[PDB]
């Protein structure tokens, strides 16, 4: 509030393994935390070119940049300056599973995100390992308070080259490092776009819009 | 077309919850194109039910969903041949239900035949102890696959004394003939039990359902 | 051996739906409860010829016929004459789910099983709806006590025409209708064999051997 | 086939995160690969004392040490000298999920295991974060061949302080780095015993017996 300015930058440090292939990624992002608008530029710094779809990593690259209306408590923004962690499970319909963890901290006008990524049982002839994916559909996260924590669930879908969808379910648990005022039951609508990349996706630029709201029919 | 701006319907439901057998009959009406409907349910066999009415309320009407013109309406197109649905419900304490529906049309009246099977509800959990207080408004992600419409919802039952009891629905809609398939979209709903008797052997509920594109797109 | 004779008969009544297809089945069985051997003959009395693999129904057609060594409490036999129920979830690797409930009672020398079967989301071109299955691999149930109940889990596999397996996970909860002495952590090994059938599986004969044991390596 | 000696040593290097908490572990093992007997000494080298049950790490600390009968192809031993990887998903009954990967290689008389562990959504008041677990029951893996890989499934159970079990399912995929002769459907029975440890589990000694077999009732 005082803590988070209307324009902020951030830094992403991600490392992990997909089917045992190790990688590191660094990003530089910026956006407007109260408008729910952000952009980031990512470089694969280790283990590139990645032999799997960039798309599984794009949503691990920024929760404080969500536009919350005044009458819904904003759990993440409240968690600063101490900050918060998040823990994500991703269950893909062909049996692949990822677990992703983030620590999020603030230094002046900059957030820092440390992300560990672990994914496996992606089928070798499936669309992640053959790189046949073409972006996530726009998605919606169901959010509710439980034991001091914010719990989110999304039905996600990757568009497939040649048509059709490849489904994934996200469960993300957000954990503020102090007690904050808990929101009621609500949603966050997002779209995540890859707006630029080089040929082997060792460089990527992404755009996201995130807006909290009440249920549409209530 | 086939579907009038005002329609009634009849629900015949039967099934078992933790092995306890029941039948329910219902009388509904609403406006298919406005996504508004109301039903009165009677437990006709196996009442009073020793579990929460709320697990049955979402099984009692897909034609009554307001579709905008630029989103094909899968279900309404399936008439007069009609359609079936197959639902799985996975509750967070391990309970699972499988529910199947057949929907048909006779003039001005739909008929829904519903078979419900739920089990592994913990004897001391909120369903068996009747501690649930209705569903949160919910949202269904819908997409097309192999001529079928596949829906998924994160549902939540409100609990007496506070907190939620979670359930994930997967519902697959199967038109009995080919129809024009819609793109990726959502349906928002609110289901409210507006009346009931002391033991929930008689229940009235009201549902609003509205289709839309993604909000942020 | 005062409630359960060394030779018993049984009657099965099963009804249910698969992908909305309604059916009924009746069976006459016989066996040696203490030897863990049994045979049953089944007839599809309503809804036949069934448009799906008989194999999804075969395991639902008799727990009292399991050979328990003397030093492992036999939850199911102890429940008699009052009897017991079971509740089963079946999760198939292509997304199909079944839920099955049984009530088991005893009248003299005969058990009666009432079974309600509900299965759905079987892909139209998958192995069940296309009848491509060729019996169940021999299987093992992991069994432990909790809350006065016996809880069982099995990794099951259907053999496929042309090679390969089609996987299914079972979870079965056994509920004695009176309190009984609870067994420790143990296993039941079974093999279910279809030994005869007519061309459309409207008549089926099955044999099952079931023997309880302690962990092999302990 | 004597790339693998009758007595062998190994080195384990494990790193990972549990609920965001980073750790590293090193171990020194020895055993008899043809007898399915092995023991290992573990040291938490970074991030100790760990704020969670050692027990969730103990099964990530040795597949070549399984006794195979001659008439069951031994997928893992055949993989050497090229070796193999494995990818494991653990689903705990209270919603916790871990993803574990291993690379296994051989140099002379010594195996080297590199293991990456990612666990999260352990409830703060659950038995893992409150350290209420007292070892794994002996367990049994169902194994079959698929697409040149070996697929395994176990129903596991941790014993609890005060009585009761805390359940976990393991799905493990073994991937040989060259083609090998594939086994039919079979099981491996194991017991994993922590035979010594210090007060905060920063040092641990473990013993494992593993033996493959055909189905007991077939
Ligand atoms: Cl895989
Ligand atoms: Cl709370
Ligand atoms: Cl239960
Ligand atoms: Cl389609
Ligand atoms: Cl289907
Ligand atoms: Cl007990
Ligand atoms: Cl948690
Ligand atoms: Cl193979």
Numbering used by the authors:
A (entry chain B), C (entry chain C), D (entry chain D): 5 to 65, 69 to 225
B (entry chain A): 6 to 65, 69 to 225
Paper lines:
The resulting proteins, Rtms5Y67F and Rtms5Y67F/H146S, have green fluorescence emission (, 508 nm), and are the first FPs reported that have both green emissions (500–525 nm) and a phenylalanine in the chromophore tripeptide. Each of the protomers in Rtms5Y67F and Rtms5Y67F/H146S consist of the same 11-stranded β-can motif typical of members of the GFP-superfamily of proteins. Located at the core of the barrel is the circularised tri-peptide QFG chromophore maintaining covalent links to Cys65 and Ser69 of the main-chain. The structures show evidence for the presence of an acylimine linkage extending the chromophore conjugation system that contributed to the green fluorescence emission.
Within the asymmetric unit of Rtms5Y67F there are 2 tetramers with 222 non-crystallographic symmetry which both match the biological unit predicted by analysis using PISA and the biological unit observed for Rtms5. The absorbance spectrum for Rtms5Y67F/H146S showed a single species (, 430 nm) whilst the absorbance spectrum for Rtms5Y67F showed two major species (, 440 nm and 513 nm) and a shoulder at ∼589 nm. The imidazole ring of His146 in Rtms5Y67F is rotated around Cβ towards the benzylidine ring and contributes to a significant increase in the non-coplanarity of the Rtms5Y67F chromophore compared to the Rtms5 chromophore. The benzylidine moiety of Rtms5Y67F is twisted out of plane with respect to the imidazolinone ring with tilt and twist angles of −178° and 53°, respectively averaged across all eight protomers whereas the 4-hydroxybenzylidine ring of Rtms5 is twisted out of plane with respect to the imidazolinone ring with tilt and twist angles of 170° and 43°, respectively. The average angle of 121° for the Cα2-Cβ2-Cγ2 bond in Rtms5Y67F is close to the ideal angle for this bond, compared to angles of 139° and 140° observed in Rtms5 and Rtms5H146S, respectively. Two waters (W292 and W1092) not observed in Rtms5 or Rtms5Y67F/H146S, contribute to differences in hydrogen bonding around the chromophore of Rtms5Y67F. The Nε2 of His146 forms a water-mediated H-bond with Oε1 of Glu215 through water molecule W1092. Notably, this water is within 2.1 Å of Cβ2 of the chromophore methine bridge. It is possible that the proximity of W1092 to the methine bridge contributes to the observed red-shift in the absorbance spectrum of Rtms5Y67F compared to that of Rtms5Y67F/H146S by coordinating increased electron pair density on the bridge of the chromophore. Rotation of the Ser69 side-chain and repositioning of the acylimine oxygen in Rtms5Y67F place them beyond hydrogen bonding distance suggesting a change in the charge associated with the acylimine oxygen.
